[PDB]
């Protein structure tokens, strides 16, 4: 179906590729050329994940427990070449399908943006999430010299990867880009709660009260912290905090291993060894 105000917006055109061939809707979704490509990229990737679960690490360890399902990358001994399907090659195909699905999803958003005549901030913001994924499975493995540095595709097994990569630097909290990325993540969560609270508290005021104005919003945080960023700028700030967190997270993992091999606390020895002290 479509929203009660949606029909006047369902217009032909705005496609990047395909023209009128794929320009249609399936239920609520707009498909387009990249919806078709993205769906079958996703379909093949999901089916190979299920097949990877079906064969498992081996026959005895095979499991359909969704927590324990894991499709692992190749051994580092394979370098940047292709691996046999049951020795990490399935991970390589799924990664390619994932990249195809994510880029198609981003490009489908571009076509939707063109149909609606709105800005391209949303596909641009999603590209940062894709870029972070690309750093994890493409850029860092290539810089490290092996596809085996990618994280395994498993709900809990990719947490074991994060844990062990973190302890490859003995104390990952001292990663300066990690500290900056966490600061943006925590600040974003704080800024999101503040923004959600302010909008809700103004449009849903006290019992027997009218909806507040923009003056109330500015006055409220000026009364608390002495500064109000503004109704428009809080969305810039929220976008900046969220994208900066992902950018610095991509930096933090790409410098871990490729551009730094010692323990992360040792990186701060440049500060400790300044001749000032």
């Amino acid at each position: 179906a479509m929203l009660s105000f949606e029909r006047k917006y369902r217009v032909r055109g705005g496609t990047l590729i395909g023209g009128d061939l794929f320009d249609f809707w399936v239920g609520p979704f707009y498909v387009g050329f990249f919806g078709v490509a993205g769906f079958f990229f996703a379909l093949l990737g999901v089916l190979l994940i299920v097949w990877g679960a079906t064969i498992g690490p081996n026959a005895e360890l095979q499991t359909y427990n969704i927590w324990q399902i894991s499709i692992a990358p190749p051994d580092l001994s394979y370098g940047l070449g292709m691996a046999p399907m049951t020795e990490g090659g399935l991970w390589q195909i799924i990664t390619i399908c994932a990249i195809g699905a994510f880029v198609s999803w981003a490009l489908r958003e571009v076509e939707i943006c063109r149909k609606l005549g709105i800005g391209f901030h949303i596909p641009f913001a999603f590209a940062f999430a894709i870029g972070a994924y690309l750093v994890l499975v493409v850029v860092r493995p290539i810089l490290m010299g092996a596809w085996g540095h990618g994280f395994p595709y498993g709900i809990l097994s990719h947490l074991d990867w994060v844990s062990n990569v973190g302890y490859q630097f003995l104390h990952f909290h001292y990663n300066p880009a990690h500290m900056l990325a966490i600061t943006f993540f925590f600040t974003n969560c704080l800024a999101l709660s503040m923004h959600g609270s302010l909008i809700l508290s103004v449009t849903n005021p006290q019992k027997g009260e009218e909806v507040k104005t923009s003056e109330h919003e500015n006055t409220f945080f000026r009364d608390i912290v002495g500064y109000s960023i503004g109704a428009l700028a809080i969305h810039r700030l929220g976008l900046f905090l969220a994208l900066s967190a992902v950018f610095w997270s991509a930096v933090c993992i790409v410098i871990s291993g490729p551009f730094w091999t010692r323990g992360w606390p040792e990186w701060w020895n440049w500060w400790l060894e300044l001749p000032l002290w």
Binding site: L76, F169, G257, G263, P265
Partner: protein
């Protein structure tokens, strides 16, 4: 900042990320600083025995004079090459023990001989040599004493932590893990081995002490935590590496060295060999490994000197 790619050694299962990363140029520099000494030519078999020629040989009495002379030449290179043969001897009287270096070095021979014969769970036929620690220096470069930590006001009890220290690889972890673990035998394990609480009262602060020790262990061997652990379960031996078993014996081996060999020599050593708390310079993991997963990157020097093995 370093430049990629590092030399990576995979230890665990693929995707588990149990790997060792080595900067090839940093590794090259480390190896050049940890080169072994070429073994002396083999002594001539036969000849006079030490027992019926020398007067005050109490440890190496099972050798022949040819091998004994070769041993003294080697330990001179290993310990006191600049100071020469007179560093450990009274000039003109070889049998004299009236010099502290002679008394210490005799106990050092027992240390090496006990290590090469009774601690193969750790040194595994590679063995140790006087050069493994001393590296041509009378005082080994990497030794430790009980660290008081940074200076504190007279009425402030030291915490022993929250202070940037190279002993814990520049973290704020408790900066003196040597004393409770490598000299005393404090429990290193802190993690409970049941899903639900079952009486493990170990404090979170005690985990920071184990973490500090593990930072020093990993820095001493130039490895990361995954060299011996699967970080998803640090307690679990089934998911660990064989190097964790070796490191377990090394901890007991170092305690044996410090308690039974270094500590009884404290009275003989001068004041310059002691820390602020009066304890002598002691042996840590860094003393032999000196930043490498094996001392001298696995160079085999002890096997060429039969004087370094117990009879």
């Amino acid at each position: 900042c370093e430049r990629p790619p590092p030399e990576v050694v995979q230890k665990g299962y693929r995707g588990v990320a149990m790997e060792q990363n080595y900067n090839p140029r940093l590794l090259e520099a480390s190896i050049k600083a940890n080169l072994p000494v070429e073994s002396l030519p083999a002594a001539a078999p036969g000849g006079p025995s030490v027992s019926d020629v020398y007067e005050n040989v109490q440890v190496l009495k099972d050798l022949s004079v040819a091998e004994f002379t070769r041993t003294m030449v080697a330990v001179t290179t290993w310990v006191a090459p600049k100071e020469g043969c007179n560093y450990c001897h009274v000039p003109g009287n070889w049998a004299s023990d009236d010099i502290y270096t002679k008394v210490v070095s005799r106990r050092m021979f027992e240390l090496v001989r006990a290590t090469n014969s009774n601690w193969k769970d750790h040194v595994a036929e590679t063995g140790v040599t006087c050069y493994t620690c001393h590296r041509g220096n009378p005082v080994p470069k990497y030794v430790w004493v009980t660290d008081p930590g940074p200076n504190q006001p007279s009425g402030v009890t030291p915490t022993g932590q929250n202070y940037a220290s190279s002993t814990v690889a520049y973290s704020a972890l408790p900066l003196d893990p040597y004393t409770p673990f490598l000299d005393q035998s404090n429990e290193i394990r802190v993690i409970g081995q049941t899903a639900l609480p079952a009486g493990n009262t170990t404090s979170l602060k005690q985990a920071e002490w184990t973490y500090g020790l593990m930072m020093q262990i990993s820095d001493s061997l130039g490895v990361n935590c995954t060299f011996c652990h699967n970080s998803r379960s640090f307690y679990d031996w089934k998911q660990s590496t064989p190097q964790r078993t070796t490191a377990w014996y090394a901890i007991r081996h170092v305690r044996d060295i410090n308690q039974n060999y270094i500590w009884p020599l404290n009275d003989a050593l001068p004041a310059s060999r002691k820390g602020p708390y009066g304890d002598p310079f002691k042996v840590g993991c860094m003393t032999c490994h000196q930043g490498a997963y094996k001392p001298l990157y696995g160079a085999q020097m002890a096997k060429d000197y039969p004087a370094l093995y117990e009879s």
